[PDB]
Amino acid sequence: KNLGRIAQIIGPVLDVAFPPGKMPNIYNALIVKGRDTAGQPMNVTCEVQQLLGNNRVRAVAMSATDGLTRGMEVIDTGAPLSVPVGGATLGRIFNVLGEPVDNLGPVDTRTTSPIHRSAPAFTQLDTKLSIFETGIKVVDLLAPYRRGGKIGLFGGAGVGKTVLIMELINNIAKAHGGVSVFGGVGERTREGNDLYMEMKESGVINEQNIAESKVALVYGQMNEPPGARMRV
Amino acid sequence: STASRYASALADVADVTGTLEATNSDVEKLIRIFSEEPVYYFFANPVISIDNKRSVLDEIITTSGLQPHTANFINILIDSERINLVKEILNEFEDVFNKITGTEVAVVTSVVKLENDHLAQIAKGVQKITGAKNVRIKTVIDPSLVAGFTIRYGNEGSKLVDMSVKKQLEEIAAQLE
Amino acid sequence: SKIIRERIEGYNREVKVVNTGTVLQVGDGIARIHGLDEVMAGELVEFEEGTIGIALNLESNNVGVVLMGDGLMIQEGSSVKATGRIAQIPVSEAYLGRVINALAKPIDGRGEITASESRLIESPAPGIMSRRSVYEPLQTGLIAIDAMIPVGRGQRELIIGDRQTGKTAVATDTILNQQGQNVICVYVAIGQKASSVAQVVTNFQERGAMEYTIVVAETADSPATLQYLAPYTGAALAEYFMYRERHTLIIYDDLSKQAQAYRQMSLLLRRPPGREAYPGDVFYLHSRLLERAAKLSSLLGEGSMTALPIVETQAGDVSAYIPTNVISITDGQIFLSADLFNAGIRPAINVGISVSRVGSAAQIKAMKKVAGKLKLELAQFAELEAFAQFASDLDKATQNQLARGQRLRELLKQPQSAPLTVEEQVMTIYTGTNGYLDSLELDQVRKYLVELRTYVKTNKPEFQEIISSTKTFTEEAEALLKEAIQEQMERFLLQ
């Protein structure tokens, strides 16, 4: 229940004079209800980057901001990017907004959870340093890839992370019961289109049996004003 | 601050003048004058012809009848474009008045609108505790004040002293302790 | 009091101009501007002295306008009446030959290029859903390009190198081969020398490529607003071709100039400077710029938008923030090694460091059958490039693979505007793989391969017909190629 006038906009850094009381917290979200280029209402996902004071705040939106005029109201969501969690993401190529960028219809799932969240605690975790065992033979042999782990890649295209990550996706889907979040940050849209074509083509996106689709596709567009991409 | 410096100089002008009360009256009147956001913008837009703004400025100096020291203070101020930085220095003039005075405004905040006798006792006790020359009482009948009160005093309202649910916070602490 | 408030009410009613904003801080093509607050973000606005102001900095106080050019007549307090329109350049196909300045207005002088559809320069990018597979090929004319790096219709590739290198002209050679292609050719010459701009234009119309090519250009003396958006303007020109389902290609002269420009912009905006003074927004800006270039989906008609990025390594920084940013951004990359040019090989493509993403989807299988062997032998000679001075003691297969890679290395070079077709290159590659050029000597195989191309254009044109129609290296066609190969081999063997 907060409405902030679009105070300034230093490009994609927007500024928002919120109300003196109704000024949100850090990383609290806001739908900037501006016009479109059509003048139709378009709502941007401004993110509370900096409480700039004098009841104003330097915000960042993820999408673009052309057509926005100063003083435009942003109803603060007042919380993190509550995103459609669970299986509606497991299969729909979902935008940073939580729309399925796939054009697979709307992701009808009530579970929209806070994005910039904490990690767990020093007591909650499971410190058996287990092997995220692949099924790919060399990683089985060579790579003691930790379960719960951090498998850094010094290799990409040509070296074949497409097919290898695809077989890894099928393998964690099959040998484990675990599911996969694949995120193309700053995405080559050639590689993004081919990637969704691959997961459909592999059936990782089980193309008929959607949401039996074993993957969850979150590309981050390089075309996104890359303040989008920091929170992806 | 330099805004606080502008306030301190206005108070110094009114103080070596003796018009601390008089230009304080001018300060409140001109505060309500510059409270007009259209008047504050028209005086404070860069698009304002400072010729025409000076015209309207002497016009407003009539239109509330300002004392001369504060009038020339405003003239130097809007002359030095800190009219854009105006209002809080005006607000700081209040504290500068108290800096001139030692009349310390302290905000009580109680369950009821408390007794003016109890107000007198608290202002006297704060004139001892503050060591104050005087005490502008700044009352409040606070809703979340369960039964007791809350006197923010000091230079700011820094010196909080409260017994309303504050003891309940202490009890929850000693419970948690 | 409303006498005084009437007086300041009239004064502020004078200050209550809606569309207008007076020029507050007139500096160097940039203005703070009182008034004109209610503008949307980023529009053009008509200042006094008519001046087009790019509403870059939505200041809370002011109205920060990138002026279109120099505003000495744009006086103090110059009222910018808000225009509200932004960048809607009228794009039509009627510029395909006109050389437009940034208003889609012919800096040619070819007359007002008539144009009804007006697109704002930054239109949105095509989704990954909006793009199909990259099936159809581009073809540079550079046999060495398409061999070692296949170019699809509507893809993203850089050409990094150094100053004006003829990498400029390498793009021009691609533009030349676009004449045989069905793609719309569009020369985006940011910041070239004017004489260079004209010699390029003369190269285009002299090729008649300016039939297939429109031209847009930023001056070196450009107002960097025009520089700072004219890239997106050419991108929208590609949109008016590519949303029309057409193959179309663009040649973006080095956006490093635009990077210095946006550096000058944000520094002119008094904005936050980033990695080596380029703005951080240059990452997203060039990202939005190069983002839209693709073959579309068939839902959008598979219209190819084939980008050509000029990137010049400033004294060989393969990792300028510009360069490494593009290196992130691209899919095909073309490092240039004028070491080869200094040793003689134009094209001086650094064939090793020039890495690409698309690959065989962009190659003809016709090409691919030869080209895999070209890759294998190429890397073989590449490791074996050490053996050269001691290659007196070279083994038979060692000196022989050296000879094979040597003839293949001979099978690379091409001058300024020595483009070839697919099929002539197919003959060239099949011979150079087929060791008929392992026979022929250094300059001998150059002229003899030229002669083999000519005497295959004559003496085996139906093999070229099959290589057209099938677009597949037929064993019949490879046989006719071997036939004409031995024939012209005899012809140049008599010499």
PDB file of N, CA and C in Angstrom, chain A residues 18 24 63 65 71 80-81 83 87 90 104 107 113 118 136 139-140 159 164 169 184 197 201 203 215 218 232:
ATOM      1  N   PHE A  18       9.046   8.068  -2.583  1.00  0.00           N
ATOM      2  CA  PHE A  18       7.975   7.348  -1.927  1.00  0.00           C
ATOM      3  C   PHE A  18       7.287   8.292  -0.953  1.00  0.00           C
ATOM      4  N   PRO A  24       9.856   1.879   1.216  1.00  0.00           N
ATOM      5  CA  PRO A  24      10.061   0.452   1.492  1.00  0.00           C
ATOM      6  C   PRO A  24      11.421   0.109   2.073  1.00  0.00           C
ATOM      7  N   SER A  63      13.437  -4.515 -16.424  1.00  0.00           N
ATOM      8  CA  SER A  63      13.095  -4.263 -17.808  1.00  0.00           C
ATOM      9  C   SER A  63      13.513  -2.854 -18.201  1.00  0.00           C
ATOM     10  N   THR A  65      12.735   1.176 -19.540  1.00  0.00           N
ATOM     11  CA  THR A  65      12.035   2.266 -18.882  1.00  0.00           C
ATOM     12  C   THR A  65      11.654   3.417 -19.794  1.00  0.00           C
ATOM     13  N   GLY A  71       7.448  11.341 -11.826  1.00  0.00           N
ATOM     14  CA  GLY A  71       6.282  11.462 -10.989  1.00  0.00           C
ATOM     15  C   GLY A  71       5.306  10.324 -11.105  1.00  0.00           C
ATOM     16  N   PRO A  80      10.782  -8.811  -1.610  1.00  0.00           N
ATOM     17  CA  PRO A  80      11.602  -9.338  -2.705  1.00  0.00           C
ATOM     18  C   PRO A  80      10.756  -9.782  -3.895  1.00  0.00           C
ATOM     19  N   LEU A  81      11.442 -10.232  -4.938  1.00  0.00           N
ATOM     20  CA  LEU A  81      10.772 -10.685  -6.152  1.00  0.00           C
ATOM     21  C   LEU A  81      10.156 -12.048  -5.869  1.00  0.00           C
ATOM     22  N   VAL A  83       8.467 -15.075  -6.712  1.00  0.00           N
ATOM     23  CA  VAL A  83       8.580 -15.650  -8.043  1.00  0.00           C
ATOM     24  C   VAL A  83       7.845 -16.978  -8.059  1.00  0.00           C
ATOM     25  N   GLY A  87       6.850 -26.344  -9.739  1.00  0.00           N
ATOM     26  CA  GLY A  87       6.802 -27.050 -11.010  1.00  0.00           C
ATOM     27  C   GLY A  87       6.350 -26.229 -12.189  1.00  0.00           C
ATOM     28  N   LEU A  90       9.282 -25.504 -13.413  1.00  0.00           N
ATOM     29  CA  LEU A  90       9.961 -26.690 -13.903  1.00  0.00           C
ATOM     30  C   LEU A  90       9.355 -27.094 -15.230  1.00  0.00           C
ATOM     31  N   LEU A 104       4.364 -20.072 -22.897  1.00  0.00           N
ATOM     32  CA  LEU A 104       3.650 -21.284 -22.554  1.00  0.00           C
ATOM     33  C   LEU A 104       2.448 -20.986 -21.682  1.00  0.00           C
ATOM     34  N   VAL A 107       2.046 -18.919 -15.779  1.00  0.00           N
ATOM     35  CA  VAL A 107       2.454 -19.921 -14.806  1.00  0.00           C
ATOM     36  C   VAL A 107       1.499 -19.848 -13.630  1.00  0.00           C
ATOM     37  N   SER A 113       7.754 -16.850  -4.264  1.00  0.00           N
ATOM     38  CA  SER A 113       8.583 -16.800  -3.075  1.00  0.00           C
ATOM     39  C   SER A 113       9.603 -15.680  -3.163  1.00  0.00           C
ATOM     40  N   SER A 118      17.843 -15.409   2.150  1.00  0.00           N
ATOM     41  CA  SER A 118      19.036 -15.802   2.870  1.00  0.00           C
ATOM     42  C   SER A 118      19.534 -17.139   2.340  1.00  0.00           C
ATOM     43  N   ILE A 136      27.859 -39.484 -16.124  1.00  0.00           N
ATOM     44  CA  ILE A 136      28.902 -39.257 -17.110  1.00  0.00           C
ATOM     45  C   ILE A 136      30.198 -39.826 -16.575  1.00  0.00           C
ATOM     46  N   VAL A 139      33.515 -37.667 -15.336  1.00  0.00           N
ATOM     47  CA  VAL A 139      33.220 -36.967 -14.100  1.00  0.00           C
ATOM     48  C   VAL A 139      33.024 -37.955 -12.981  1.00  0.00           C
ATOM     49  N   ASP A 140      32.470 -39.119 -13.302  1.00  0.00           N
ATOM     50  CA  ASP A 140      32.429 -40.198 -12.333  1.00  0.00           C
ATOM     51  C   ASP A 140      33.833 -40.584 -11.904  1.00  0.00           C
ATOM     52  N   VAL A 159      33.587 -27.063 -26.621  1.00  0.00           N
ATOM     53  CA  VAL A 159      33.824 -28.062 -25.587  1.00  0.00           C
ATOM     54  C   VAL A 159      32.566 -28.793 -25.140  1.00  0.00           C
ATOM     55  N   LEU A 164      26.505 -31.954 -22.886  1.00  0.00           N
ATOM     56  CA  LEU A 164      26.956 -32.539 -21.633  1.00  0.00           C
ATOM     57  C   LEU A 164      26.066 -32.119 -20.484  1.00  0.00           C
ATOM     58  N   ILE A 169      21.582 -33.194 -17.180  1.00  0.00           N
ATOM     59  CA  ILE A 169      20.225 -32.888 -16.785  1.00  0.00           C
ATOM     60  C   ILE A 169      19.400 -34.152 -16.763  1.00  0.00           C
ATOM     61  N   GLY A 184      20.441 -19.332 -18.354  1.00  0.00           N
ATOM     62  CA  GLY A 184      21.303 -18.684 -19.315  1.00  0.00           C
ATOM     63  C   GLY A 184      21.410 -17.200 -19.074  1.00  0.00           C
ATOM     64  N   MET A 197      15.263 -25.278 -27.655  1.00  0.00           N
ATOM     65  CA  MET A 197      15.103 -26.260 -28.711  1.00  0.00           C
ATOM     66  C   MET A 197      15.779 -27.565 -28.344  1.00  0.00           C
ATOM     67  N   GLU A 201      14.027 -30.777 -27.569  1.00  0.00           N
ATOM     68  CA  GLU A 201      14.553 -31.776 -28.473  1.00  0.00           C
ATOM     69  C   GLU A 201      15.080 -32.976 -27.723  1.00  0.00           C
ATOM     70  N   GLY A 203      13.782 -33.667 -24.912  1.00  0.00           N
ATOM     71  CA  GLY A 203      12.747 -34.029 -23.983  1.00  0.00           C
ATOM     72  C   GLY A 203      13.076 -33.667 -22.559  1.00  0.00           C
ATOM     73  N   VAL A 215      13.529 -29.974 -16.780  1.00  0.00           N
ATOM     74  CA  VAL A 215      14.340 -28.786 -16.594  1.00  0.00           C
ATOM     75  C   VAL A 215      13.462 -27.635 -16.129  1.00  0.00           C
ATOM     76  N   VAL A 218      15.581 -20.696 -17.043  1.00  0.00           N
ATOM     77  CA  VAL A 218      15.613 -19.280 -16.732  1.00  0.00           C
ATOM     78  C   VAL A 218      16.768 -18.688 -17.508  1.00  0.00           C
ATOM     79  N   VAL A 232      19.229 -12.266 -11.293  1.00  0.00           N
ATOM     80  CA  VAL A 232      18.649 -13.427 -11.953  1.00  0.00           C
ATOM     81  C   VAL A 232      18.988 -14.688 -11.202  1.00  0.00           C
TER      82      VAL A 232
END
